[PDB]
Amino acid sequence: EAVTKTVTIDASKYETWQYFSFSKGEVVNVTDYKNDLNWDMALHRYDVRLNCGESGKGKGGAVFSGKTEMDQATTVPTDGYTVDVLGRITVKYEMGPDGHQMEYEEQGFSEVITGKKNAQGFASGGWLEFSHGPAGPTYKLSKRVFFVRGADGNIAKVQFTDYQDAELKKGVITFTYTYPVK
Amino acid sequence: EAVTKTVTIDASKYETWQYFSFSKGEVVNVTDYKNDLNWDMALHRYDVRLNCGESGKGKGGAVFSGKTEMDQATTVPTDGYTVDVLGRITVKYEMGPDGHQMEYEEQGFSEVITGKKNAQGFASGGWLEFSHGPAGPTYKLSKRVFFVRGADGNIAKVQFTDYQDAELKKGVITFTYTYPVK
Amino acid sequence: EAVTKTVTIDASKYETWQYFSFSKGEVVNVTDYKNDLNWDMALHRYDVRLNCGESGKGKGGAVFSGKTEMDQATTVPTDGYTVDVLGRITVKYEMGPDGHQMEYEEQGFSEVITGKKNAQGFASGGWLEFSHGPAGPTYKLSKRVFFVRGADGNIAKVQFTDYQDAELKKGVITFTYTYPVK
Amino acid sequence: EAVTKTVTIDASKYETWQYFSFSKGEVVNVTDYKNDLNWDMALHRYDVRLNCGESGKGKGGAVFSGKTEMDQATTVPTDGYTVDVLGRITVKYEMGPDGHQMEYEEQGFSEVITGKKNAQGFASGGWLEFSHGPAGPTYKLSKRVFFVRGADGNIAKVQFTDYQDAELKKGVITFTYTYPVK
Ligand code: HEM
Ligand code: HEM
Ligand code: HEM
Ligand code: HEM
């Protein structure tokens, strides 16, 4: 019943989100995300949004399994799936004479999967530990395995395996998902 | 009775701390800080250390009054004082082709007065909100008023009023203290 | 006889060049650029290469008209078309904890059109004055109008009108060319 | 006859110059530098000024000996000395959220000793090759030996040996001079 697939989606654009359907195994087009149960997980740079809470009207949510290997996460939770909350999303980014200038909006996202952003905007505790050295970005994949309820309540087991493409283009996101589970 | 004074100390050096005596009203020389009751408060860049906890054998500690005006903090707390804990201290700093390279040591400091340092080393919640924009430092004095036990337990009311001198040299620290109180 | 067109080419990739044919009005595929007269002008980020000198075996070359408006450049030079010389080309670029790390090769390019690069790698005097502020890039289109000999000796009048696309993606290059002239 | 000495002067301040007398072997106080024969050489950060040309009314000037070892520069030139010209001098510097913000004035300086400054303000060809990597400063002492006429025309042989002090404070300048020669 459960099938495992890998998915790569280019979420490099700051202005928009890429919406994905677990059952379709494809990116889907979404013009009214807060009123649309056709998507299960959305990506924007290294942010992840689910169809629930502050992001939508579905049955979505996420829990961290405690595991960093997919095959070690064998008990599918029946409750405790945390719902999306409001947080800062970077919707414009441009380098110029004063460094990277950004614009932001408060929008819904999955703090469990994305991580929590600190005072300077760095997220940790989710799928990607993002920081800086003295003069630019550092990246560490956490390998955290999540259980993720889709808009219809069916669950995927999800692990994010890359944040860049094979040409090292950043914001191109790869994950494995096994779906539907228990 | 209580005397109020302003004090300015150059704590710009990364390698060392400046040690101060409330009763003497002077910087004192300290070679064994963990075993010396002759100092009450020590400064290093924007870090503050007290003679207690992980920093010394004295009766020191700090509590935030809840106020940002000296003349409004009239009741001297008997309770809620916090002793120094271990935290990251920047002991070397040098700009070069790869930005500011730093070295650190875990040492005792007053989290109440200094603030808590986050993942990238920015302190907030104490006397100085220190952050960065896209390409360098930002500063905001909190004006928080603290009650500060010295090495012998006698209390000063303390507020930090500047982080730079009149020529804008950073790491030159100015505070008002009223001592001894209640 | 002479036709005026605008052309936009995405030259954002550091590792390769985009080769253009004046007569075809199209990007052409070039696997042996030093031995191929099918291309007239090539772009790589803000660098421009012509089919001549250190870059190829054609009859190419460039001269600055002295003008910053196309319709003011009415006398087509019959000689003095400067041939490509060797210069530093950035063939890899990646941001990380130590800033932008780059790799370089010495290759042929048109110094007349590209400009001359200084000690830190900033080009000026050609189609784009590129510099930095204290913390990143600044750009100024020079509007210089060039006469540009193609591989077969036919001349285009060329003016570069943008260095970014309508979404502000850098390294997407737009120019007007009028061809063939006198 | 000729005496050789080493001199270290703190020229770290951006707003002012440090004025030196070859004969006195001391820093001198100068309030009207353009009309004062009591100074021979002045330092500001890595800039060097002589009492001649655009900098003063004296008989000063400089020539590069062609050597990088004091003991190899044995013949004292009679000819090829260059007087000070106008150039950009950084008179204010402050790090903030947008990087280092600077202010400038056009003033007299010795291009021979200082080097020529390029479009982004980096000097080379004089006593110190100053550049940047991706995210901050780089330094290389050239060891160039200069013959330097003082205000009265008497000549010193001069080589700059350091740009920082023994605690690595930048803008503290050390030079050897042999005076008066030939
Ligand atoms: C030398 C100066 C700097 C350089 C070259 C630099 C470079 C970069 C680059 C290339 C990115 C995109 C990374 C990615 O999305 O994969 C980025 C993002 C970011 N930078 Fe910097 N950075 C600099 C300074 C700073 C400073 C001082 C801070 C704050 C203390 C900062 C905070 C951030 C944050 C929070 C992001 C993520 C923005 C977002 O997408 O939400 N950066 N930086
Ligand atoms: C354009 C790049 C940068 C510039 C020009 C810059 C500049 C500075 C300056 C001038 C200071 C000294 C401030 C003071 O003590 O008053 C400083 C300190 C500091 N910077 Fe940066 N910075 C840059 C990038 C970064 C980044 C990307 C981070 C975060 C990863 C960072 C984190 C810090 C921290 C934590 C301190 C305080 C160090 C300490 O004393 O403990 N900086 N920076
Ligand atoms: C805060 C630190 C810095 C930031 C955020 C920054 C940002 C950037 C960006 C975004 C670009 C790409 C511009 C484009 O191709 O359209 C670039 C290119 C470049 N930067 Fe920087 N830069 C920084 C420091 C420096 C320094 C210190 C230098 C040298 C003094 C420098 C020299 C260059 C050069 C020469 C290029 C063109 C590279 C090439 O394509 O050949 N940068 N920089
Ligand atoms: C990460 C970004 C940068 C950092 C951390 C940085 C750091 C510094 C530091 C520490 C100094 C003082 C060096 C000394 O006098 O000994 C300096 C000076 C200087 N920087 Fe930068 N820099 C940065 C970006 C840039 C860029 C992009 C440029 C070019 C546009 C630049 C041009 C200069 C120049 C010309 C000076 C000498 C100023 C003078 O005294 O006349 N810097 N920089």
Residue numbers in the entry:
A (entry chain B), B (entry chain A), C (entry chain B), D (entry chain A): 35 to 216
Text from the published report:
In P. gingivalis, heme is primarily imported by heme-binding protein, HmuY, and its cognate outer-membrane receptor, HmuR. HmuY is an outer-membrane-associated lipoprotein, which is identical in sequence to a P. gingivalis envelope protein designated fibroblast activating factor. The protein is functional as a dimer in its heme-depleted form and as a tetramer once heme is bound. Structure similarity searches following a variety of algorithms failed to identify significant matches extending beyond selected parts of the central β-sandwich, so we conclude that HmuY conforms to a novel all β-fold.
In addition, we solved the X-ray crystal structure of holo-HmuY. The structure of HmuY is asymmetric, with maximal dimensions of ∼55×40×35 Å, and it resembles a right hand. It consists of a roughly globular nucleus reminiscent of a palm, out of which protruding segments mimicking thumb and fingers emerge. As anticipated by CD spectroscopy (see above and), HmuY is an all β-protein constituted by 15 β-strands. A single Fe3+-chelating heme b molecule (hemin) is inserted laterally like a wedge into the cavity, curiously with its charged propionate substituents pointing toward the palm and the hydrophobic methyl and vinyl substituents pointing toward the exterior. However, the most relevant contacts are the metallo-organic bonds established between the heme iron and the Nε2 atoms of His134 (2.04 Å away), provided by thumb-strand β8, and His 166 (2.09 Å), from ring-finger-strand β11. These two ligands occupy the apical positions of an octahedral iron co-ordination sphere, whose equatorial ligands are the four porphyrin nitrogen atoms (at 2.03–2.06 Å). The quaternary structure of holo-HmuY is a cross-like tetramer of complexes, ∼95 Å in diameter, created by the combination of a local and a crystallographic two-fold axis. The overall arrangement entails that the four heme groups are in direct contact with each other in the center of the tetramer.
